[PDB]
Design a protein around this ligand. Structure first.
Ligand SMILES: [Mg+2]
Ligand SMILES: [Mg+2]
Ligand SMILES: [Mg+2]
Ligand SMILES: [Mg+2]
Ligand SMILES: [Mg+2]
Ligand SMILES: [Mg+2]
Ligand SMILES: [Mg+2]
Ligand SMILES: [Mg+2]
Ligand SMILES: [Mg+2]
Ligand SMILES: [Mg+2]
Ligand SMILES: [Mg+2]
Ligand SMILES: [Mg+2]
Ligand SMILES: [Mg+2]
Ligand SMILES: [Mg+2]
Ligand SMILES: [Mg+2]
Ligand SMILES: [Mg+2]
Ligand SMILES: [Mg+2]
Ligand SMILES: [Zn+2]
Lengths: 104, 48, 86, 60, 123, 129, 155
RNA sequence: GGUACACGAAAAACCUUACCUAGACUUGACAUCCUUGGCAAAAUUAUGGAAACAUAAUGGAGGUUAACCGAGUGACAGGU
RNA sequence: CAAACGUGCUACAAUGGCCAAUACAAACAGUCGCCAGCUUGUAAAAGUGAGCAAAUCUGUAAAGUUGGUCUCAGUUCGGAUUGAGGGCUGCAAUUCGUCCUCAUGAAGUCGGAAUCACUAGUAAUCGCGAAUCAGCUAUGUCGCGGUGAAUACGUUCUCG
């Protein structure tokens, strides 16, 4: 038995919310199918960006619509991984939208 | 009764022109565009 | 205003012509488009033709005009009298 | 006179301060979003089609 | 009072009394006050000759208040005797820096001399 | 047997710890003297408004933790917090406290600025011409 | 054209003298959205009232404000030329409101020194029926007495 | 007019810029289609230059022409 | 630029000016950036230089409380205008950048006829952040929070 990686801090963030929740359920199921003690799926504050754009083409600055872009964020810290988990981590297939911030 | 003159400018500003001529003759084409570098990626599953 | 370390500023094209023109005795008004060049002490005694936007106005530099910018002693626009609207 | 400014924008200038940001779809110079490189009225058309993931209308 | 031809108010503190002089403002007055070591909050009427000599010497060391007026006058004459575009702009009683002159900048143009706006019978 | 209450007002949390004691209440806010936490502009009474008309002789030592807001908003948070801790000691007190409406979240928060408007509800000056 | 009657916010009992009316006048002298400042100014005037009149400040304040308080209100009603007025009995809530509004307006115009002493003099000056607020109340009352005839027709 | 006037313009020193004065160019700064080759454009250093642009230089990633670099070439490109 | 109008900012002040100490936010933004601390400088800033790809590091909260002073003056109000010396960005700040320091101290003591907005965290007010941006008298615009009111009897008149 070995570890080769103490304190694997996986970080997740994506523009969409529901897929992000789906990715957390899939990641957790595989890592508990192997022998690892997950600390917990904590939520992080969502970075929201807002852009204001005038609706009209030429005049009337007053009529301006709004748009938003939410950066939903999650955290995941792995205690001990071992080969049993890393090889199974290769078959995860994360839906494009979710972005991983693996920090080793 | 007159204390000669204590004005005339020139002298003080003259050093400023001397500084400027030295800079212009020093001028080295150190054209560049940037600062911090590297640490630019989006990560993966470390091998997918 | 303008920093110290930087100093003054000439485009250095004006500098090359002025050194050549000061050595040459039979000086004639110098045609410069550089309104950005500050008047340097060595410039004294020469005459320049600054581009006001339309023509080249002739300026005779003295021992006093040293320090300002070469375009400051020429105009760009002209206004001398309005006209009754009604 | 649109294309030449568009073409000139792609070409590198001789001074760093000579570089401005133009819309990449049209050639409009003012009101360009550096976060997306797209002007306000192309961003509206593009946002109303779903090309930018996550740009939803805002209700606060 | 007694400081040169200026008559600083007698019932007013000294650090404001120096401001009342033309060539000395407020910041330099504190500089004179601190350099001479004379303590503020001492009404000028309740002061002695010993302080009145130190302040006059340092005031004399700085630029005389009467000479600044001639200093401003020569600078305008120096700028106008140069033929500068800023000087011409200073010449016709207009903002010398970059202030706009379309609808504002009346502090240099005095009172308003209302003329007659154009006649619009409609088109 | 301590009791805990969590009040809020203008985005300001509150952690009030109600401890039974018989040696004077000793009002305390965030480990500091009330006389030092507030501009003492007579705001101290407000929080005690439900603790006065009922009683303060039971000398409950209060351990308040408030993090956020200004000072009236923080004050608004703890008044609600004391009442929420008060709903665990003698549920009868609730009835009389309910009457005066001292057991309801104020629901009053600052509105969002709107585009084309100089504020939440302001609007630019209109011109007949 | 509305058919709805507006609600009313609580007035709050005062925090010192337990006399509601103090909170209303505090809000009246409010400027710049300063709750603190207004309280300080007003409460400071009571300390001066103690120092000057040697009596209870709440008693002097009620005697001044209740006395300045008017009875008749003249409502403007134009038909063809100028306006013929109509005297009506004001409700009690509005009755108190004009007195406080009036007390502050004449306080911020006196030739006196810091408005602390200014407002203190106005309140002490209205307890003896000789001031600026009295004249205003007298003037509106005399207009109503003069205009007793048109009281029957209101609208 | 209300429904224009801190409006287009969520940034006019040069650039932006569409304007004026000047110095320069003509299948053109950019594009396709056609006969035809690629053994470059850049960038930068010189001289003349207000800078455009010219005459000289390291002759340049590459991939054998992919993209582009061109010649020839008339349909045309182009117009804020 | 002889002028006129619109929208805002600053004021004409002791509910204030100046000085000292000091408590309490939310949101947002950041690797050609945020820039902590330290050294120099009357200051804008410069040098050194960690930390932070960010619930971690950075972007001083101000009004507010207390103390001292001014004592109602065209002033310790008000800051325009003007002169000089500096700092930053940028090839380049004269036409035409802004900041700091020093100097001066216009008008203005509540504004005529007539008009505008607002029904609670609203009107009024105090700061903070972002967008476009090398830099910008944006006092503009878009957002976030701190304090926080008065009044609505009624549809006779007024506009739609
Ligand atoms: Mg076009
Ligand atoms: Mg300007
Ligand atoms: Mg219209
Ligand atoms: Mg130009
Ligand atoms: Mg131009
Ligand atoms: Mg080759
Ligand atoms: Mg070949
Ligand atoms: Mg056309
Ligand atoms: Mg505004
Ligand atoms: Mg004070
Ligand atoms: Mg920490
Ligand atoms: Mg006056
Ligand atoms: Mg002032
Ligand atoms: Mg300048
Ligand atoms: Mg006055
Ligand atoms: Mg309403
Ligand atoms: Mg205001
Ligand atoms: Zn576009």
């Amino acid at each position: 038995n070995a570890v080769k990686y103490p304190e694997l801090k996986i970080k997740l963030e994506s523009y969409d919310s529901t897929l992000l929740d789906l990715t957390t359920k899939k990641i957790v199921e595989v890592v508990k199918g192997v022998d690892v003690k997950i600390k917990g799926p904590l939520p992080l504050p969502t970075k929201k960006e807002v852009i204001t754009i005038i609706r009209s083409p030429h005049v009337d600055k007053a009529s301006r619509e709004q748009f938003e872009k939410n950066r939903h964020k999650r955290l995941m810290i792995l205690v001990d991984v071992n080969q049993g988990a890393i090889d199974s981590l290769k078959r995860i297939k994360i839906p494009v939208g979710v972005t991983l911030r693996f920090s080793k | 009764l007159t204390k000669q003159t204590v004005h005339g400018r020139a002298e003080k500003l003259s050093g400023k022109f001397n500084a400027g001529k030295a800079f212009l003759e020093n001028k080295t084409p150190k054209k560049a565009k940037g600062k911090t570098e590297e640490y630019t990626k989006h990560r993966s599953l470390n091998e997918l | 205003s303008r920093s110290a370390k930087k100093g003054a500023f000439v485009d250095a094209h004006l500098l090359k012509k002025v050194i050549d023109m000061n050595k040459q005795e039979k000086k004639r008004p110098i045609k410069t488009w550089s309104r950005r060049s500050t008047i340097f002490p060595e410039f004294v005694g020469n005459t320049f033709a600054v581009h006001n936007g339309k023509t080249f106005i002739n300026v005779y530099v003295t021992d006093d005009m040293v320090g300002h910018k070469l375009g400051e002693f020429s105009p760009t626009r002209n206004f001398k009298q309005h006209t009754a609207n009604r | 006179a649109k294309k030449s400014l568009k073409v000139k924008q792609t070409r590198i200038p001789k001074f760093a301060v000579r570089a401005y940001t133009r819309c990449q779809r049209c050639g409009r110079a003012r009101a360009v979003l550096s976060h997306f490189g797209v002007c306000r009225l192309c961003f509206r058309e593009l946002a109303y089609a779903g090309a930018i993931p996550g740009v939803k209308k805002a209700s606060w | 009072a007694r400081i040169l031809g200026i008559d600083i108010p007698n019932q007013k503190r000294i650090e404001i009394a120096l401001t009342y002089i033309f060539g000395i403002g407020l910041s330099r007055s504190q500089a004179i006050l601190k350099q001479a070591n004379i303590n503020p909050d001492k009404r000028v009427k309740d002061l002695t000759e010993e302080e009145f000599v130190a302040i006059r010497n340092v005031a004399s060391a700085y630029k005389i208040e009467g000479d600044l007026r001639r200093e401003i006058a020569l600078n305008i004459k120096h700028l106008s005797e140069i033929g500068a575009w800023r000087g011409l702009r200073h010449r016709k009683n207009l903002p010398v820096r970059g202030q706009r002159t379309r609808t504002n900048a009346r502090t240099r143009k005095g009172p308003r001399k209302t003329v007659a706006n154009k006649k619009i019978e409609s088109k | 047997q301590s009791y805990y209450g969590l009040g809020r007002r203008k985005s300001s949390s509150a952690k009030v710890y109600l401890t039974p004691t018989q040696d004077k209440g000793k009002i305390t806010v965030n480990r500091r003297d009330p006389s030092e936490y507030f501009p003492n502009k007579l705001v101290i009474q407000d929080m005690e408004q439900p603790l006065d008309l009922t009683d303060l002789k039971k000398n409950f030592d209060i351990n308040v933790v408030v993090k956020g807001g200004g000072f009236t908003g923080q004050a608004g948070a703890i008044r609600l917090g004391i009442v929420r801790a008060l709903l665990q000691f003698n549920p009868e007190l609730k009835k009389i406290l309910k009457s005066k409406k001292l057991t309801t979240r104020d629901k009053r928060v600052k509105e969002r600025k709107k585009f084309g408007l100089y504020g939440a509800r302001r609007a630019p000056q209109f011109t007949k011409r | 054209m509305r058919k709805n009657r507006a609600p009313k916010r609580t007035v709050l009992p005062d925090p010192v003298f337990n006399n509601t009316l103090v909170t209303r006048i505090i809000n009246v002298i409010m400027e710049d959205g300063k709750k603190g400042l207004a309280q300080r100014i007003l409460y400071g005037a009571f300390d001066l009232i103690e120092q000057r009149t040697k009596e209870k400040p709440l008693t002097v304040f009620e005697r001044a404000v209740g006395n300045v308080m008017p009875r008749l209100e003249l409502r403007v009603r134009r038909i063809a030329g100028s306006n013929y007025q109509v005297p009506t009995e004001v409700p009690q809530d509005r009755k108190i409101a004009l007195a406080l509004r009036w007390i502050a307006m004449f306080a911020r115009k006196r030739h006196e020194k810091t408005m602390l002493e200014k407002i203190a003099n106005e309140i002490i000056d209205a307890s003896n029926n000789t001031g600026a607020a009295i004249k205003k109340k007298d003037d509106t009352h005399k207009m109503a007495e003069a205009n007793k005839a048109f009281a029957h027709m209101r609208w």
